Design a protein around this ligand. Structure first.
Ligand SMILES: CNC(=O)c1ccc2c(c1)nc(-c1ccc(Br)c(O)c1)n2[C@@H](CNC(=O)COc1ccccc1C(C)(C)C)c1ccc(OC)c(OC)c1
Length: 520
């Protein structure tokens, strides 16, 4: 009786200032899924947010001569400005400084304490002061021993000697849920995407035994405090992970969003945090007796020919610069086209320009401009109504249009965005080829071939309309501009349902008398 719901999330971003195209990819990709699911008729909720706690945030605020909230408000303003600039269709933005989040972190922690899933112990970690990163005994390089116990070592990055750090900490005993998690994987084979990551998780993390998780610290203050032991602050594991249910008003005075949208249909994230969403998150939800998420999707990185982009190498590509210089459509298209499923992508300015110029401006932009120009020149702007596949090429081309939609659909549902886009561009290329094959200018000579000329123009515009509709989730400007210039005004003709049967324009239409570039 009601629309089926679809809840999609990106990870909450840690506001350390440097937002590169790698961070933009997650929110753009999430936006594409969100827009696609809305067009399919789902009741969609798309969430993003920020991780605002931890020692480092408060150190950075204090160093800058600001309060924690002053500092964070400025950083979050910048992040939300970028999302608005990328036209991210997120329905909400969760900040971990909000009471709706803090209340959940406190209540979840207290519940696990009362159930006995969390117990007090002592955290022991290997810390590198230069790198400010902790490690387990297992990953120290050139470890030193004494009586069989690891006594120290070298950071597996910097190469500086690590320091043994100890502090009182609450532990979450996750190992007892091991069997339940493996059974969950068995009954939900599509849970982890790409599917190759599942056995890597099992082998590297679950098979060797899940260590108790240190979920609190006593060494810093900026964060959620444990109500029944206020010297303890909740660490990132529970604090960050419950953002996905705290955003829905879980345990608030109004849980209606939580009742409607939980569980999440897809958690989208970069591959380096999929182990936390694949193991810790499901086990935490089991401990709270909540339904698990249906799917976790890990995407690859957008590299340079220096390696991972970072502020430290001066490697960072700024999405603001790309948008200001080349436009939004070009930026979103490049991100979604160049990062294939289960692999990494590689950014170069030359590759960006080729995609932008060859695919968008040339293939799609000139197809629209050539078509509109021919309709203005041969029929004074009045596009003859579609009649049927009159030309010998039409039967196979009309079939290709439907095969394009079908292929696009199975690519999108399998999260293969780059293949969906390449499939659409094969159709755009074929439409340009249709012009060369039919030579409209030759047909415009003979007065006998005026119906055949009208048929060709009708097939050009119907091919364009198919392309425009399929690109609606990816490009936020181009499709609107194409519909505008073609003077296709009817909202129904911009939806997926209007692609079921080829040739919906069975009435004459007057196209723009002043066509302009679709891009930039
Ligand atoms: C010099 N150091 C850094 O540049 C530095 C970099 C990251 C820092 C960080 C400092 N201090 C914090 C921090 C610490 C305490 C609290 Br409470 C908190 O709040 C955040 N973080 C956070 C940043 N937060 C994240 O990346 C958010 O991750 C998630 C998002 C959604 C859901 C789940 C997650 C998890 C955390 C499960 C991946 C952090 C701490 C430890 C981590 O692994 C050991 C980690 O893995 C990606 C992320």
């Amino acid at each position: 009786s009601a629309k089926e719901t679809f809840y999609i999330t990106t990870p909450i971003y840690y506001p350390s200032g440097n937002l590169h195209i790698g961070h933009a990819y997650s929110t753009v990709a999430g936006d594409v899924i969100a827009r696609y699911k809305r067009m399919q008729g789902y009741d969609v909720r798309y969430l993003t947010g920020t991780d605002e706690h931890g020692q480092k945030i408060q150190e950075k605020a204090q160093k800058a001569g600001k309060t924690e909230i002053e500092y964070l408000d400025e950083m979050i303003a910048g992040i939300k400005q970028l999302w608005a600039k990328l036209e991210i269709s997120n329905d909400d933005f969760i900040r971990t400084t909000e009471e709706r989040h803090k209340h959940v972190v406190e209540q979840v922690f207290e519940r696990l304490l009362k159930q006995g899933d969390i117990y007090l112990g002592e955290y022991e970690g290997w810390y590198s002061v230069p790198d400010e990163t902790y490690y387990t005994e297992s990953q120290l390089v050139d470890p030193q021993y004494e009586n069989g116990k690891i006594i120290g070592g070298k950071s597996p990055d910097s190469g500086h000697e690590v320091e043994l750090v100890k502090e009182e900490s609450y532990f979450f005993n996750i190992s007892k849920y091991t069997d339940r998690l493996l059974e969950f994987y068995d009954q939900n084979p599509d849970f982890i995407q790409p599917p190759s990551r599942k056995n890597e998780m099992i082998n590297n993390f679950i098979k060797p035994g899940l260590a108790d998780l240190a979920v609190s610290r006593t060494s810093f203050n900026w964060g959620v405090h444990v109500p029944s032991n206020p010297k303890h602050v909740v660490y990132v594991w529970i604090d960050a992970l419950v953002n996905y249910i705290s955003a829905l008003g879980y345990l608030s005075d109004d849980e209606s969003l939580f009742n409607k949208y939980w569980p999440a249909d897809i958690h989208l994230m970069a591959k380096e945090i999929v182990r936390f969403h694949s193991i810790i998150w499901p086990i935490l939800l089991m401990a709270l007796d909540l339904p698990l998420p249906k799917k976790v999707f890990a995407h690859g990185w957008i590299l340079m020919k220096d390696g991972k982009m970072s502020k430290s190498k001066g490697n960072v590509v700024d999405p603001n610069i790309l948008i200001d210089r080349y436009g939004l459509d070009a930026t979103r298209y490049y991100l979604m086209r160049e990062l294939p499923f289960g692999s990494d992508g590689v950014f170069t300015p030359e590759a960006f320009v080729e995609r932008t110029n060859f695919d968008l401006a040339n293939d799609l932009g000139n197809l629209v401009n050539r078509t509109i120009s021919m309709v203005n020149k041969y029929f004074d702007g009045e596009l003859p109504a579609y009649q049927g596949p009159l030309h010998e090429l039409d039967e196979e081309m009309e079939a290709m249009a439907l095969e394009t939609v079908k292929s696009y659909t199975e690519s999108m549902e399998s999260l293969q965005f780059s293949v969906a886009l390449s499939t659409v561009w094969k159709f755009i290329s074929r439409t340009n080829k249709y012009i060369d094959e039919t030579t409209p200018w030759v047909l415009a000579k003979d007065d006998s071939q005026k119906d055949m000329l009208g048929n060709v123009m009708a097939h050009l515009v119907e091919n364009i309309r198919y392309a425009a509709v399929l690109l609606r989730p990816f490009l936020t400007h181009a499709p609107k501009e194409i519909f505008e210039q073609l003077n296709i005004n009817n909202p129904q003709f911009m939806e997926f349902s209007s692609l079921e049967q080829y040739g919906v324009l069975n009435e004459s239409i007057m196209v723009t008398g002043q066509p302009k570039p679709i891009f930039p």
